[PDB]
Design brief:
This is part of a larger assembly, with 9 protein chains of 9 kinds. Chain A is mostly loops and about 90 residues long. Chain A contains 2 helices and 2 strands; from the N terminus they run E-E-H-H. In chain A, strand 1 and strand 2 form a beta hairpin. Chain E is mainly alpha-helical and about 100 residues long. Chain E has 3 helices and 2 strands. Chain H contains 4 helices and 8 strands. In chain H, the strands form 3 sheets. A 4-stranded antiparallel beta sheet of chain H has the order 5-4-3-8, with no helix packed on it. Chain H has a two-stranded antiparallel sheet with strand order 1-2. The chains are: A little secondary structure (about 90), B alpha+beta (about 50), C mainly alpha (about 80), D mainly alpha (about 50), E mainly alpha (about 100), F little secondary structure (about 50), G mainly alpha (about 50), H alpha+beta (about 130), I mainly alpha (about 120). Chains in contact: A-I, B-G, B-I, D-F, D-G, E-I. Chains D and G meet through helix 1 of D and loops of G. Bound molecules: zinc ion. Zinc ion (ZN) binds next to loops of chain A. Chain H binds 4 RNA strands through helix 1, helix 2, strand 1, strand 4 and helix 4. Chain A: InterPro entries: Ribosomal_eL37, Ribosomal_eL37/eL43, Ribosomal_eL37_CS, Ribosomal_zn-bd. Chain A: Keywords: Metal-binding, Ribonucleoprotein, Ribosomal protein, RNA-binding, rRNA-binding, Zinc, Zinc-finger.
Chain lengths: ~90, ~50, ~80, ~50, ~100, ~50, ~50, ~130, ~120
RNA sequence: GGGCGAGGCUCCUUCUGAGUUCCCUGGAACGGGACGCCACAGAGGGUGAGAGCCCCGUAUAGUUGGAAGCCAAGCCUGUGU
RNA sequence: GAGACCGAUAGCGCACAAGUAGAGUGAUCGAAAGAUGAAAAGCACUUUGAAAAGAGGGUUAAAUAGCACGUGAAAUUGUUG
RNA sequence: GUGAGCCCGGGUCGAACGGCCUCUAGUGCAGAUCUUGGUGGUAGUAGCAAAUACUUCAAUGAGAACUUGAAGGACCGAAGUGGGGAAAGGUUCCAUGUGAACAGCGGUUGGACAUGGGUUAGUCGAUCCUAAGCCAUAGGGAAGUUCCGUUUCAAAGGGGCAC
RNA sequence: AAACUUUCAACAACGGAUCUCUUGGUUCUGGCAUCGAUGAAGAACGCAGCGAAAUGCGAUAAGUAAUGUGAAUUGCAGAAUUCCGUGAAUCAUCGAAUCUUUGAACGCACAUUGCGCCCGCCGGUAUUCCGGCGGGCAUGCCUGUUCGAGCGUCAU
């Protein structure tokens, strides 16, 4: 009875949602995320899984601040207002 | 509840005797505010809110 | 909701003794009395002094907590420390 | 325009209706060649099924 | 003789950038010449004789002139590198030629 | 690309009675699972003698 | 369960708001390729994974 | 033959840029030639077309028709001309999209920005002619 | 109505800007109830008041920051939001004067023997 | 030792040549025939079918307006604590 | 910026709302899927049907292109000879 | 044409393609229990046979064994086929409407599909306490990711009085 | 003789091969140096008149300011634009801003929208009660300030 009848007793949870990465990988007894390694400071990644690295590498998300950096570099990180522009 | 009653008072001059709040399955909060017996909720809905 | 605890509100927050006032302001007693005289901080009397402090006697001096917090921002405290 | 929109909505369902999906939510992919049925050999000892 | 028993494919170096690197070097030389004009783009080098018995028949350019050579030619060792003369303090003069 | 046809985890099901011994993509819930991999005769696999 | 946390109830609220078909005005747009909701969810078919 | 290294003769890049150009670029792309009278009047060969211009169709099955530009539909790169329409099955009218390169502008919709455009194009043309002459 | 131009806002000072912000917020709050009670052309108006509130807040913030920069024009320490952003590495980079400081022996050598301008005859 | 500095370089911005002439097929000429024109531009793309001259661009010298740096022929000066 | 490369079972796993849908407690695994037409002009109206639809009649240069849509092979099937 | 093949005619079709000489290769298939996809005979076949059971009238509807109302007959038989919860699910709850698909027969019905609505607390829980146990700090190991350590070889803090 | 089975042909099916296409890959070459406690990469939740996704954005939420262009956006609805203009746009540029809950994540925690502390401001009869808002409170280390401990060494 290791199959169909034993599958009926599965109503607990080993993993919950992790606050850092959003996956259901936070082990509920060890309080450690199996994916990102929370609450360790460094995000968990390994070089034997290039797929796992590419699933969470920079650019797979929003680039909320980092996408505006090349334009500011191209303009030389200038500060101020265009000459004669309306304002205060 | 305190924020809701303060907002109602400073919006529409509404005095409430109690407020019950729930959070709906869509994720927004719904608030039932019972008014003082001196003021008429039907009159408030007709004039201030336009709920006819 | 959550049950309040005894002695965490009321006259216990409204008043403090001279000992608690000098410990709050980190002042010596002459400097505290001098600053109270200069700023007009007056002694007070609670209705029940045991509600403020269980060791209070008839000779215990009480002040307002808001008066002590107003004294906490006086520039003369810096002058006292500079002179020391 | 409402008739054309409803016709477009009904014509969008023809592939899933031929696939007999119960709505657009039925996207489940069934195992057509399971490993437990298409791998291994049956020995004289313990078996994987009766 | 030739063997490939290591993982040789990870470190194969091809040279399709040879004409591009020649173009880059020539552009850098033109920029350096324009910056250094009207001075020459290179420094004056002494004539030195190659070591060992195989190459002692031939002379070539060395690193820089010795302090004895600069003093005998009348050029101070602080003025010499400022007018395009290379100076080498390690080399000595073992003969007068 | 030097990774073409080799970015999969697949293993042969072994000698049996039903299917050929090509390595097959593991897992479930998708069309790719159970399909062949890594062969030049396989769809979505590495070709014979990749060009360098 | 009836006993649930605020985080779980918020995720269920977002799922309930996402569970809808596409508007019919989408299919009449110029160069439209969307024909149905390809990410539609049903309670009996697939799980939220919470 | 192109010489400048910033110019690309790639067909894929050209088609991607053309079909993903934004609205201000599509305005320049949707240019129309001027008539002979307007050309000898303003010394300008071409100008971007805008709503309110008066055009004559010189190519297609609607050739020699004349009308006012009622819409510049930059999304499918077409213009709508008044009375150059067809009938739907129902009997209602529906406009026929014309490419601006298949029309010629006979009367310009004039305002101070249009005069600025024409003046600077004419000034550049005469400056170029004087320099190369 | 309800579409306040920024050119009008750039001349006002603080109190009437706050008054305009208050009246726009009040009319927006009323017209949301009008939206939920009936359908009409008031949706364009609620969009206009949302953008007008955004413009008024932008003008107020810009004038506040300009006044604060004028106040902190001649002071050694500025607030972190008023300090130039650049990048973290650029902020931690040495200043131009500290990068151009040389030793006094080096100063003497560069004073009395700099790089000369020379040419060689052919 | 200081201070000017003509001029040059780097970067964005305005502008650039010539047929929609006639005939046939065609739903549509961007095809075929004829007569031309431009070219330091006959790269590429779009336009109802293979378009140098319909449109964007393309080639070359330049030409408008602006910002910030660098190089620099020369010129004023103090002179030795 | 380019190519004596590949042309949708190829080329990156992905030319498409692709590291998506989906599977697994989990680490992880991981697809399929492009093309009406120049222009929707995506069939008015009549008629038979409960409707889907059909038949007339239309649009188109073509419906032998009808949102199952360029071309439309073979296996395999129906009718007719 | 010995042959691999080449060329033409008729039909379909709609935007490119070929001959010759050199150059180049991811270049020629019946097999690999080959890969992917598609399709046959079997075959209108095996089968749709546990849980005692259905019948009459009327209404609805194009269409009713499995929709509804009434009329009968039965079953669960209080360790229930009843009334409520914990885990788990997440809107499946309720009203209205419904073409296709799904409900291995039908379907007007539906946990399906479409549009909306619904969950109101000082007193019920969580929140508080500690259990088994886990994680910080002091400090000590470890190349290091980190491990031990949880009262220690820690300056680890509370109160009152004062002319 | 028909039916059935098989073969041949035409048309119609089934299926998606072939041909042509390509806003896509792959490989090479050239140029550039620019993430984060002034809060990054990543995660979650929201924002459009009518959107689930993709895209864009953050309660100023398919966006604000500024500069430039100069008449659109479009699937519908509704408004435009004094067109001789502080001016459309799902426009471009982009120097000013806004930037929810998180995350190295910083009051303590977090399987809790849990529990605190310090200082101001405002409102409700309020010296005490109640509520809201704003600014703060991690660790190691460096320089300096100030308050200190020790017969550790001295002077007196
Ligand atoms: Zn995690």
């Amino acid at each position: 009875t290791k199959g169909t009848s034993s599958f009926g007793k599965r109503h607990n949870k080993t993993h919950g949602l992790c606050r850092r990465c959003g996956r259901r990988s936070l082990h509920n007894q060890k309080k450690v995320c199996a994916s990102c390694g929370y609450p360790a400071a460094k995000t968990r990644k390994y070089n034997w899984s290039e797929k796992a690295k590419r699933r969470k590498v920079t650019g797979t998300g929003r680039m909320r601040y980092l996408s505006t950096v090349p334009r500011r570099f191209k303009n030389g990180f200038r500060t101020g207002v265009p000459k004669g522009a309306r304002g205060p | 509840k305190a924020q809701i009653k303060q907002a109602l008072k400073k919006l529409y001059d509404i005095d409430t005797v109690k407020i019950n709040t729930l959070i709906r399955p869509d994720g927004t909060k719904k608030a039932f505010a019972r008014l003082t017996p001196d003021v008429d909720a039907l009159d408030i809905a007709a004039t201030k809110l336009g709920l006819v | 909701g959550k049950a309040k605890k005894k002695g965490k509100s009321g006259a216990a927050r409204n008043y403090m003794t001279r000992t608690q006032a000098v410990k709050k302001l980190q002042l010596s007693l002459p400097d505290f009395r001098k600053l109270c005289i200069w700023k007009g901080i007056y002694p007070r009397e609670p209705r029940d002094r045991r509600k403020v402090n269980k060791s209070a006697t008839a000779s215990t001096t009480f002040y307002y907590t808001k008066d002590i917090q107003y004294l906490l921002h006086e520039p003369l405290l810096q002058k006292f420390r500079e002179q020391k | 325009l409402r008739s054309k929109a409803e016709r477009q909505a009904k014509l969008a369902q023809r592939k899933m209706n031929r696939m007999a999906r119960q709505g657009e939510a039925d996207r489940h992919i069934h195992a057509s060649m399971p490993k437990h049925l298409f791998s291994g050999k049956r020995t004289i000892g313990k078996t994987d099924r009766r | 003789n030739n063997h490939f028993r290591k993982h040789w494919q990870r470190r194969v170096r091809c040279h399709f950038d040879q004409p591009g690197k020649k173009v880059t070097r020539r552009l850098a030389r033109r920029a350096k010449a324009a910056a250094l004009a009207p001075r020459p783009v290179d420094k004056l080098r002494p004539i030195v004789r190659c070591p060992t018995v195989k190459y002692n028949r031939r002379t070539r350019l060395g690193r820089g002139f010795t302090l004895e050579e600069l003093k005998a030619a009348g050029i101070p060792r602080l003025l010499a590198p400022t007018i395009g003369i290379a100076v080498d303090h390690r080399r000595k003069n073992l003969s007068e030629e | 690309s030097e990774k073409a046809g080799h970015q999969t985890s697949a293993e042969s099901w072994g000698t049996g009675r039903a299917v050929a011994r090509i390595p097959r993509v593991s897992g479930g819930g998708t069309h790719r699972a159970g399909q062949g991999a890594f062969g030049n005769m396989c769809r979505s696999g590495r070709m014979f003698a990749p060009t360098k | 369960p009836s006993h649930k946390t605020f985080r779980i109830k918020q995720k269920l609220a977002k799922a309930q708001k996402q569970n809808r078909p596409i508007p019919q005005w989408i299919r009449l747009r110029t160069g439209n390729t969307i024909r149905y909701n390809a990410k539609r969810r049903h309670w009996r078919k697939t799980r939220l994974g919470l | 033959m192109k010489v400048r290294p910033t110019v690309s003769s790639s067909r894929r890049k050209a088609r991607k840029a053309h079909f993903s150009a934004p609205s201000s670029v599509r305005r320049v792309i949707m240019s129309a030639p001027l008539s002979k009278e307007l050309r000898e009047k303003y010394n300008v060969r071409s100008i971007p077309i805008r709503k309110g211009d008066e055009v004559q169709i010189v190519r297609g099955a609607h050739k020699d028709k004349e009308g006012k530009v009622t819409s510049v539909y930059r999304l499918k790169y077409v213009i709508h001309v008044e009375r150059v329409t067809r009938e739907k099955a129902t009997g209602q009218t529906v406009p026929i999209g014309i490419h601006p390169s298949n029309v010629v502008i006979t009367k310009l919709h004039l305002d101070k920005d249009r005069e600025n455009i024409l003046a600077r194009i004419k000034a550049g043309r005469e400056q170029v002619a004087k320099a190369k002459g | 109505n309800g579409k306040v131009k920024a050119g009008q806002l750039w001349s006002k000072n603080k109190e009437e800007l706050t008054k305009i912000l208050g009246e726009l917020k009040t009319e927006l709050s009323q017209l949301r109830i009008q939206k939920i009670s009936s359908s009409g052309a008031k949706l364009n108006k609620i969009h206009d008041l949302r953008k007008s509130i955004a413009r008024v807040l932008t003008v107020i913030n810009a004038k506040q920051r300009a006044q604060l920069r004028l106040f902190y024009k001649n002071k050694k320490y500025l607030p972190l939001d008023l300090r130039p952003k650049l990048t973290r590495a650029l902020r931690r980079r040495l200043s131009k004067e500290d990068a151009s400081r040389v030793l006094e022996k080096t100063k003497k050598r560069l004073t009395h023997f700099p790089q000369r301008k020379y040419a060689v005859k052919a």
